[model samples]
Target: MRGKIYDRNGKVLAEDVERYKLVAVIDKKASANSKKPRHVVDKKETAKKLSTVINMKPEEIEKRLSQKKAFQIEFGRKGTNLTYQDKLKIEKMNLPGISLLPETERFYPNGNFASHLIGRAQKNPDTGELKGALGVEKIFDSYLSGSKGSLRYIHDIWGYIAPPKRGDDVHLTIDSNIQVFVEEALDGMVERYQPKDLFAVVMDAKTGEILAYSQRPTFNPETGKDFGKKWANDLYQNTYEPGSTFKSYGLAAAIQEGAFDPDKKYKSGHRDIMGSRISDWNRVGWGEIPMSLGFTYSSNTLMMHLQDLVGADKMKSWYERFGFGKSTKGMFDGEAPGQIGWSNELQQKTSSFGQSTTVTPVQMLQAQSAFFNDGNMLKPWFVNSVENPVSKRQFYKGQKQIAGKPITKDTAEKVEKQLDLVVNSKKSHAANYRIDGYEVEGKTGTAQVAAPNGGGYVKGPNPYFVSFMGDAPKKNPKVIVYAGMSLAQKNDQEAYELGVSKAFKPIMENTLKYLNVGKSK
Candidate 1:
């Protein structure tokens, strides 16, 4: 017994449907008085005829028929999960002993769409209980379980159709149309780059509503044999170095407190601070330049300068308020809170530029919502409501939740300006990342991976994770998307940028267009 899960709009993600299992009455008689040949009288002929309808061999069915001690036998996998039309063809055979037993099957109509988010609910045949194995199904199991109604053909000779009740139908904030757009975009990302792990999340700027979330190594709910491949949902479970993308929010705080000066001149290169020397990403640096140019170049030196003014204690607190180094809470199960190093002076300087910190993609997404949505950091949620579909009752409702206000709207606007320049900067490698009618504003991150032994960073051709978190139609933002791919392993700039753009661009453009967020000016 179970209830259904629907998208924000009307599309069933998961539901229990009627399925039939083939059963054979071996030597059972209908009655002692009027029995001519009630069940499976001619076993050899029955076996051959049954083979034509099902995929099994004649001997396969005959083997079960040879079980004389057994009063009845089932075709098992050979005949289970059959549709009503399948039952009709076999039932019309008028073959004795061959019959169909009705049962429920949990179905996913969209196949692998949002599998990481939707998870899976598998049913136990013994007690007719539905077990939520993962994702949204697992999180809302209590509400989604119980009262699985019955389904059988009324035209049947004996077993007529009946009904039952339901538990509580779950409604989610994920938009089916947008979710499809996100999933299709991810397929292409894997088509090009060979990433060890990758994930993405798209959140409505104002509402913190997750439009869609997708990841690599996902398994299909129906025929997915590769469930062992991706056990953890990358968006929430996997945490990695945020890299220079952290500069956006780090800069947002500096600007709000008047600690940042874009026009102020700065010499970009290595900066000696707190007993360690931290250099800009380029190493050689951009020489003497304005602080504004330093930021667009993703200069660690300039970000370090902001850290000097913002102070380490203040920076850590700002991030914590932004939902970093903490659990993102609602969207997924066993969410990662992430961690940032702040015990030492070197840690503080490195943390300011995101080198000393690691975060889940969901944590990054929730923080970005505050940066774009006028400083009200909204808590990310997956469920819209849990209700009784028949009675039209809402048992539980989860709308927009404001986690906190970490910055000012004025600071957000100022931060958006520099982020725009970061995209067009020759160094960001986001060239040709245009969305036609929308002006995209966001940042890219290229961060190092920690070694397994906990000694230092890893080494290889591509020892870094690449990412891009952009929002479209910049002025009045509709969607803010965060995309990350681990180890693109590219020697040149071309393939590296494609890993992020391939997933991010298609998702943002297609979603914004589908939402009809076009030029209002």
Candidate 2:
């Protein structure tokens, strides 16, 4: 009966749900010789006196004396769960037979605050309890719900409980301000782009705590209805071809293994490697470019050639080291780890450029943390901890857990230098666009969608995958934001940028400000 969402600063985001109780049934069939079902009545004339308090018409109540169907009503998911406080209000209803059922209810006063990321709760049938059925609710159920308490109560002839006891609490990890920004940004993106889907996250780079995570097509937790299936918690759930985002890992692995020659030159023409012909996002290649420049420009040829050089085994090893092939074990449901195409040579080549590989957003968040966390793979956590008001005990106060030490500090630093250039300078020169003021370090991915049937690209369509991951005050990133959009209908070159830019810039601008790291003004 207790749950609450909090922000980074320990402020409550939503709480204190209240609800009402009623005792009545609407009957459509009338019966003879009935003095009404009022077991406690002062006078016969006043039996019809109690009506407006229950919000029911007096004539309708009288007709219920004989209705074809008998249906009892109760509060639903979208509304308050009829809290104890609500019962106090019912006492004033002054109905003869109608009474209150004081119970705990879930409340989200700040609606759509990372709704997709936090998910929603469902009532547990066995205990008549509300449990975290999805999102962080499912992910950290034990913390949020706490252990059930029992008390033997008397049951009446109607089997009604004499009285019900209380339950636990749910404390969240999202910062209120952070969640506000995330919601505003996501809502705007959904309205503006109207893309197939939107996924976003604002995370603390050092602690791996997910401050804000949200997406479009979300359901109102207060109501138990369809919140479009398209709504995805991409930050922790949906996995996709990371496109050029994978280049940095390839480079990191190469640099770590001493397999890279930063100054080495490659014949950067579109060429087939192991049955997969690799090309840039634009389908052409730079004739010849230095190894670092290849990465800087997000050359598909370089990524494929590098994967061929490293071989599939080494590439897979690096992916595993980066935690790419599994769910991040975050506090949420459907946060599945995406699949990797490891067997086919073409798949491996494309995967080198983030095509054949798929990874959940949480994995991306987790994987990226290694760069700034000194090579330690910090587990991505959306829930800080859950608190139970009844017990006042903190059950799921999440602490930072280490996934593994994936790379050496020196290797991470070297990779960081090249990544910084990707956005700050390298991409600006090649792509002719950049976000100034923050020494941003990240990659841009333009992944082409694969044909649904199998083994080919989606033809005559510009279905591209684009993502941007950057940390502000790059020297020591205090915050990191990852935004991605997909399935954009494209008719021209600008369409691709349009799809990518719709989600990229606004998220970066707002998230930086929320972190108090980068101010737009």
Candidate 3:
């Protein structure tokens, strides 16, 4: 079965591409330290030539040679094997210690293109078997992973695998072109801001098929490591405090429960709820701001008041109704189930501001889908299908909606209408972020990082977190893109810049360009 993935326009991103065999290097050449002139071998003193080459005393070389056999030979180091290039270099050297052999290694023509998402395949040392670890390698192991067949026969005092059947190939959901764009955007941000993590995902909301998703601190499968240990997942496998990203849920829940008014005004006042004073993101009160304005500015105080008015039980019920506190099905390996603190007043208060709560990026995007994709929380997937060559049967078919229609069509439409203001307003500056013919809508968040002693929000410059959920063609949406970024540098202004202005906006524009979903003239 060929595990294939494509772009929104059905352009091939990853597929069962061509496969080739690799040759490994094994063998070494030994050189001894020597100096001084002595007896020559080839019509000259052997010790003199050896001493000149090694730059050592002839007496020392002679002494070492006296104690050894095979010229006291030494190679580079243990676990040192010869590669094809190494053999070629050795042939030129004409060294007596050189040996040659073969080995295998993984290769990718396009390096670090959704590497974490595509994962890697390697041989397990203990079991002596090849296996996939994490990402697509783990998710679609059987599809890309083929059977291993080798010739093995018993021999007298000898052990060797005869000829082995070629290993199977793997296809992936990552598009090379889109992946390049995602990396260019991510690399530019990481280089400038040096954020802890950044993630961008573009998918077909209707089919739940992921077009392309890439993260910062990526790795080369051939090299076997990523940016660093700290930034392991930043994409699908890890979760974070989702700041204003979760407010969309609160907005939907309040309106769906018949407690919220978009045109209505609410006083952004300080409230001591659950032993903490809930305040707007800007701290200063905006007095009476419309519900649409609340979303535009991402006011924590307004969200808390809205949740309090809606009641905890109803809010939690709505949260669960929207797929929070639940693991999204399909391609869920290593996915964080995410934490929610909605049991009591204090927990709910903090959760209202997107703290004391954790969510995978995908879940946040999926919940937003209800608003963007016609009220249905389509299951997120990458591989559309796995088809066999013989019977033409599709072994694994995508397009299955694990969670469907979490909110009514009317609820979805209302959420989009409200989001429209966010994209068009001065705070958001729709024209500055416009993609020519596409209509964009989203919210920016700069979450407070927890203090060392369990204290909340660092004093000086808190870590910044930002995200944007946008759909194209406004009137009839086909795909939604959600991108989030986190930065730990002491640049306070950078939090909003990286998360809001830097990360999400460009990703949205590039995605629209990649899919040909240009803005309306």
Candidate 4:
């Protein structure tokens, strides 16, 4: 027996799904000439027919029948685990002694939904015992899988006195409504982009609760058929540069350190870091423009300047303090602690614009979490609480975590306004990032894909990862959505870039609406 699991709203995510248990009885102590014939009138023939229903051989049944007690009567593992259709067929067969009882087994309602994240609790067919595979299932096996060891405690009492109890139910912070929204967006992106890898996560900005998390290359956890086919939980297991979507945090660091002035002019295009020319996307820099315009234009040079303004020492230290180059403590098992390398001037200049640095999607979301709640950073977490139903008490409850306050409220708002400039500015490239009745605030990024064999950046059709990270109701941030894909499209970067915002819009908008986030917020 396993425990139930639900969302924060009490919406069931998983529970004791229904099944059937077959039972049959035999009574030998009865008059053979009676009208009802309580005794086995034709044991040989009964065994032959009953064997077909239970899938047990007739010889096996007859072996037990031959040694029947005076009142030998009871059926169990003789095919106790039966299906609904099996029960239905057994009933129609008019098998006098056989019956099926309602039962429960591990089940997933949305077969393939968030399969990798929630993982699987598979029932062992041979033993009818449950064992978890990964993620929540593997993490909470001791708590979710029930203890059927009453035999150990009550063996002296013939195992009759002790009672068997189900496992404790676990509550997750995941909101199913938002999960659906996020999944649907990914569905379209997968079909359209056919990305090599895609993953998205939405976090409750203030609480650090993971509202929704999913990734591509998923399978139906309900059936082990697709098991071992596609696995990898990308969000926690892999890391990427996140490109310009990451620039906001760097900008935030600069603003907080009193090193950035939005109105100040900076020469765009390229800056000579030692000898290497660090150029903008256009290569030819846009002439003298305000720092705000540079961010509006996604100027790599401006970000490089921001890093210089903040200084590589403080800049690298600030990002390290923001949880880069380290594991997101206790977020998940086997997480990839993204890399951060800044040994020299060129490395520092480029790392400032989100190159030569790698971070997991969760880390990206967590780092930017400081923007939402008055500069207080909250680390991402999912499992809300695990409680024992019988005692109605909780054994484990996850709450909001403080990573650190990397920036002040004023600094947070200033960076948010720059993010607003990226999405809502009239000269914006994120024209596809529009949602009705809600102002979206986030940044879009395009990061170079590292070589498949680990030498340098991949060169070919698939050489970049594009993503967008944002939250809705800008005035009062509620949830943050980060969606991205690796190696999208045949050639057009323009069209594939749209996929990020395309994935982001529905998730942010649908969730904001589902959450009843006011228009003003």
Q: What is the lDDT of candidate 1?
A: 0.78
Q: How good is model 4 by TM-score? A: 0.82
Tens digits of per-residue lDDT for model 1, 1-521: 58888998868988989889988878655434555655787889988888766685998788889875777887767678888998888877788778888988888999898898888877777976877777877766766776434442212123312235576788888898888888888787776775677777888887888888888868898655576577788877787888888888788888987888888887788998865668887788888888778777778988888888888788888878787888876646787778887888887788877876878887887888876778788888777887767888776678887888888888887888888887765554465455666778788777877875678887776677788888887757888888887765443255454438777878888888898876543
- Each prediction's number of clashing residue pairs: 2, 18, 21, 2
RMSD values, in order shown: 6.6, 7.0, 8.4, 7.4
Alpha carbon lDDT at 67, candidate 1: 76
Candidate 1 residue pairs that clash: 1-148, 326-337
Stretches of candidate 1 above 4 Å error? 27-38, 54-56, 63-71, 147-163, 272-277, 425-428, 452-455, 489-495, 519-521
Best prediction by TM-score: 1
Off by over 4 Å in 3: 1-100, 124-129, 141-143, 147-170, 227-232, 386-394, 426-432, 451-455
Put the candidates in TM-score order, highest first: 1, 4, 2, 3
* Distance from true location, Cα of 5 in model 4, Å: 2.1
Please identify model 4 stretches exceeding 4 Å from their true place: 18-82, 95-104, 148-163, 490-496, 519-521
Q: Would you give me the overall lDDT of model 2?
A: 0.65
Model 3, 1-521: lDDT tens digits are: 23333333445434433222211111112223334212122212333334433233656444443433332233223223334553454446442322344334344446567777766666554543445565555555554444543342222213322333232233335456666667787777777766666778877666666777777667775456653454355555676778876887888877877778887898886778767677776667778888777777777877888887899878887778777777776554655677788667777887887887788777777787777666888777675555433445555555647575667778878877767777777766333345655676665556765554666765556566666666665646666777776664545465555454555566666766767865557
Local lDDT at 338 for model 3: 76
Decide which is better by TM-score, 1 or 3. 1
Root-mean-square deviation of Cα positions for candidate 2 versus the true structure, in angstroms: 7.0
RMSD of 1: 6.6
